[PDB]
């Protein structure tokens, strides 16, 4: 019963959170460290292989 | 210089000794071959895949 009394408020909060994580995804390049970690490990394995 | 290298430390560029034209060294086509078959219990047609 609590959803329909602040629907605009929770919609605005959802939009603000979406914008916040959109900013935070490009805020730093260290937030995806697993992906470039495994990519760098594969590239270094190939580099030491050759 | 007479010959160049890369991170892989392979001969990729070389200068000719007879003239002054810089060339490249690139290996030609290579790789394992693959096959496509539906099994001998159904048919015998196969498709070679490079
Ligand atoms: C080795 O001999 C060749 C002979 O062809 C020389 O090539 C000539 O170089 C001159 C230099 O300006 C050019 O004008 C000619 O057109 C070249 N000849 C041909 C057929 O293209 C070459 O320079 C010589 N290399 C050295 C180190 O003496």
Partner A contacted by B49 (CB < 8 A): no
Partner A contacted by B6 (CB < 8 A): no
Resolution (A): 4.7
Half-sphere exposure of A2 (CA within 13 A, CB side): 1
B12 CB-contact burial (10 Å; exposed 0-12 / middle 13-18 / buried 19+): middle
The technique by which this structure was obtained is cryo-EM
B39 CB-contact burial (10 Å; exposed 0-12 / middle 13-18 / buried 19+): exposed
């Amino acid at each position: 019963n609590v959803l329909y009394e602040n629907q605009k408020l929770i919609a605005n909060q959802f939009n603000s959170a979406i914008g916040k994580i959109q900013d935070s995804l490009s805020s730093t390049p260290s937030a995806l460290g697993k992906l470039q970690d495994v990519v760098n490990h594969n590239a270094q394995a190939l580099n030491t292989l050759v | 210089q007479q010959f160049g290298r890369d991170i892989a430390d392979t001969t990729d560029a070389v200068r000719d000794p007879q003239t002054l034209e810089i060339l490249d060294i690139t290996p030609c086509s290579f790789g394992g071959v693959s096959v496509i078959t539906p099994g001998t219990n159904t048919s015998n047609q196969v498709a070679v895949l490079y």
